[PDB]
Design an enzyme around this catalytic site. Structure first.
Site, PDB file in Angstrom:
ATOM      1  CG  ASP A  66      -0.362  -3.850   2.850  1.00 47.69           C
ATOM      2  OD1 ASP A  66       0.187  -3.281   1.892  1.00 47.69           O
ATOM      3  OD2 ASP A  66      -0.615  -3.297   3.932  1.00 47.69           O
ATOM      4  CG  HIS A 110      -1.947   1.105   1.180  1.00 47.14           C
ATOM      5  ND1 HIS A 110      -1.704   2.282   1.853  1.00 47.14           N
ATOM      6  CD2 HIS A 110      -3.147   1.251   0.581  1.00 47.14           C
ATOM      7  CE1 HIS A 110      -2.717   3.104   1.678  1.00 47.14           C
ATOM      8  NE2 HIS A 110      -3.615   2.495   0.901  1.00 47.14           N
ATOM      9  CB  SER A 154       1.877   1.784   6.750  1.00 52.95           C
ATOM     10  N   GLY A 155       4.450  -0.330   6.679  1.00 51.52           N
ATOM     11  CA  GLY A 155       5.615  -0.818   5.920  1.00 51.52           C
ATOM     12  C   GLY A 155       6.785  -1.071   6.845  1.00 51.52           C
TER      13      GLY A 155
HETATM   14  C1  LIG Z   1       3.559  10.209  -1.929  1.00 53.65           C
HETATM   15  C2  LIG Z   1       2.805   9.293  -0.988  1.00 53.65           C
HETATM   16  C3  LIG Z   1       3.054   7.936  -1.016  1.00 53.65           C
HETATM   17  C4  LIG Z   1       2.381   7.090  -0.161  1.00 53.65           C
HETATM   18  C5  LIG Z   1       1.446   7.603   0.716  1.00 53.65           C
HETATM   19  C6  LIG Z   1       1.218   8.957   0.753  1.00 53.65           C
HETATM   20  C7  LIG Z   1       1.881   9.800  -0.100  1.00 53.65           C
HETATM   21  N1  LIG Z   1       1.579  11.206  -0.011  1.00 53.65           N
HETATM   22  C8  LIG Z   1       0.976  11.938  -1.118  1.00 53.65           C
HETATM   23  O1  LIG Z   1       0.735  11.388  -2.131  1.00 53.65           O
HETATM   24  C9  LIG Z   1       0.662  13.428  -0.979  1.00 53.65           C
HETATM   25  N2  LIG Z   1       1.458  13.871   0.133  1.00 53.65           N
HETATM   26  C10 LIG Z   1       2.869  14.058  -0.068  1.00 53.65           C
HETATM   27  O2  LIG Z   1       3.374  13.873  -1.111  1.00 53.65           O
HETATM   28  C11 LIG Z   1       3.725  14.443   1.105  1.00 53.65           C
HETATM   29  C12 LIG Z   1       4.493  13.171   1.403  1.00 53.65           C
HETATM   30  C13 LIG Z   1       4.944  13.077   2.836  1.00 53.65           C
HETATM   31  N3  LIG Z   1       3.922  12.853   3.840  1.00 53.65           N
HETATM   32  C14 LIG Z   1       2.526  12.488   3.664  1.00 53.65           C
HETATM   33  O3  LIG Z   1       1.985  12.308   2.632  1.00 53.65           O
HETATM   34  C15 LIG Z   1       1.743  12.319   4.957  1.00 53.65           C
HETATM   35  C16 LIG Z   1       1.432  10.855   5.230  1.00 53.65           C
HETATM   36  C17 LIG Z   1       0.108  10.499   5.265  1.00 53.65           C
HETATM   37  C18 LIG Z   1      -0.247   9.198   5.494  1.00 53.65           C
HETATM   38  C19 LIG Z   1       0.719   8.233   5.712  1.00 53.65           C
HETATM   39  C20 LIG Z   1       2.058   8.571   5.664  1.00 53.65           C
HETATM   40  C21 LIG Z   1       2.415   9.897   5.427  1.00 53.65           C
HETATM   41  N4  LIG Z   1       0.220   6.900   5.916  1.00 53.65           N
HETATM   42  C22 LIG Z   1      -0.728   5.886   6.272  1.00 53.65           C
HETATM   43  O4  LIG Z   1      -1.630   6.196   6.954  1.00 53.65           O
HETATM   44  C23 LIG Z   1      -0.537   4.439   5.887  1.00 53.65           C
HETATM   45  N5  LIG Z   1      -1.138   3.609   6.886  1.00 53.65           N
HETATM   46  C24 LIG Z   1      -0.513   3.455   8.175  1.00 53.65           C
HETATM   47  O5  LIG Z   1       0.498   4.001   8.432  1.00 53.65           O
HETATM   48  C25 LIG Z   1      -1.233   2.536   9.168  1.00 53.65           C
HETATM   49  C26 LIG Z   1      -0.230   1.654   9.903  1.00 53.65           C
HETATM   50  C27 LIG Z   1      -0.945   0.768  10.909  1.00 53.65           C
HETATM   51  C28 LIG Z   1      -1.807   1.600  11.857  1.00 53.65           C
HETATM   52  C29 LIG Z   1      -2.604   0.643  12.736  1.00 53.65           C
HETATM   53  N6  LIG Z   1      -2.170   0.829  14.090  1.00 53.65           N
HETATM   54  C30 LIG Z   1      -2.782   2.497  11.107  1.00 53.65           C
HETATM   55  C31 LIG Z   1      -2.024   3.396  10.148  1.00 53.65           C
HETATM   56  C32 LIG Z   1      -1.246   4.228   4.560  1.00 53.65           C
HETATM   57  C33 LIG Z   1      -0.566   5.110   3.535  1.00 53.65           C
HETATM   58  C34 LIG Z   1      -1.227   6.190   3.002  1.00 53.65           C
HETATM   59  C35 LIG Z   1      -0.590   7.000   2.084  1.00 53.65           C
HETATM   60  C36 LIG Z   1       0.705   6.719   1.698  1.00 53.65           C
HETATM   61  C37 LIG Z   1       1.368   5.644   2.257  1.00 53.65           C
HETATM   62  C38 LIG Z   1       0.730   4.839   3.172  1.00 53.65           C
END
Ligand SMILES: Cc1ccc2cc1NC(=O)CNC(=O)CCCNC(=O)Cc1ccc(cc1)NC(=O)[C@@H](NC(=O)[C@H]1CC[C@H](CN)CC1)Cc1ccc-2cc1
Length: 246
Positions: A101, A58, A196-197
């Site tokens: 995942d 994810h 996550s990861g």
């Molecule tokens: C580029 C990108 C790639 C991947 C993700 C987000 C972006 N961001 C954007 O696309 C637009 N924002 C940007 O570019 C700025 C980039 C830098 N900070 C951000 O984004 C902020 C940011 C927002 C969200 C995440 C991480 C960072 N995480 C998550 O929530 C990931 N679940 C978990 O952790 C779960 C683990 C287990 C727990 C249970 N006890 C519950 C939570 C699910 C998840 C959701 C989204 C991504 C990865 C994992």
């Protein structure tokens, strides 16, 4: 003096990520930070070989291009990275073929194995972590007002057997056999957004073994809502195949 997997050069502190505590710097040398090409943290990961990082599939939903990903190694801070921190680009992404995942990243160059950068050890295939086993989760994720923001944090959590975790008062049949549960049912201590990861490790004999990959949960640190992790044991054969073949 090579560095054997699973054995930190800085002994992990215990504080028997929401809750838990800030870790000793370099106490978790396999902890990786998956980052945008612009250097923004958005997921954790675990170094399992000099050229291989394991994370959640994810974490790659925003881009299928390896060029879109950067790996941070040897770090303790999330923003003000120390000078020795290694930053390495990704060459190839390998998603688990049964839609699980979990995903492997092949680094463009091998990471330098130092006292601060050491791969984690993999479990034997199909091993089932026993109920109540104390394991550690690590990450730079949200703290929900619990302290440690911006720093590598850790939390010791008991594993909850799926039979208990899948009960109606908990996750009610959402947990699969390829997943494991960990957390304090009372709440307060748990992985959260940004973790996550990342790794779920358990101490076995004299070293830490990667048994879980932070995946999902119903909120963070809510009572009767333990976090869900991909069971690494069910994917060791696949991981070794990818690394041996590519
Ligand atoms: C580029 C990108 C790639 C991947 C993700 C987000 C972006 N961001 C954007 O696309 C637009 N924002 C940007 O570019 C700025 C980039 C830098 N900070 C951000 O984004 C902020 C940011 C927002 C969200 C995440 C991480 C960072 N995480 C998550 O929530 C990931 N679940 C978990 O952790 C779960 C683990 C287990 C727990 C249970 N006890 C519950 C939570 C699910 C998840 C959701 C989204 C991504 C990865 C994992």
């Amino acid at each position: 003096p090579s560095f054997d997997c699973g054995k930190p050069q800085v002994e992990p502190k215990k504080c028997p990520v929401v809750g838990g505590c800030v870790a000793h710097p370099h106490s978790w040398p396999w902890q990786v930070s998956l980052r945008t090409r612009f250097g923004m943290h958005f997921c954790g990961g675990t170094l399992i070989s000099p050229e291989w990082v394991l994370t959640a599939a994810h974490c790659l939903e925003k881009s299928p291009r390896p060029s879109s990903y950067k790996v941070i190694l040897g770090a303790h801070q999330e923003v003000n990275l120390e000078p020795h921190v290694q930053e390495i680009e990704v060459s190839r992404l390998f998603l688990e073929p049964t839609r699980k995942d979990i995903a492997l990243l092949k680094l463009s160059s091998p990471a330098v194995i130092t006292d601060k950068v050491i791969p984690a050890c993999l479990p034997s295939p199909n091993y089932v972590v026993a109920d109540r086993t104390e394991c550690f989760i690590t990450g730079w994720g949200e703290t929900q007002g619990t302290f440690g923001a911006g720093l590598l944090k850790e939390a010791q959590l008991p594993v909850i057997e799926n039979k208990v975790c899948n009960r109606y008062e908990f996750l009610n049949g959402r947990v699969q056999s390829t997943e494991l549960c960990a957390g304090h049912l009372a709440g307060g201590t748990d992985s959260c957004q940004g973790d996550s990861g990342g790794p779920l490790v358990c101490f076995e004999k004299d070293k830490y073994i990667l048994q879980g990959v932070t995946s999902w949960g119903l909120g963070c640190a809510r009572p009767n809502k333990p976090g869900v992790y991909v069971r690494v044991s069910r994917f060791v054969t696949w991981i070794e195949g990818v690394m041996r073949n590519n």
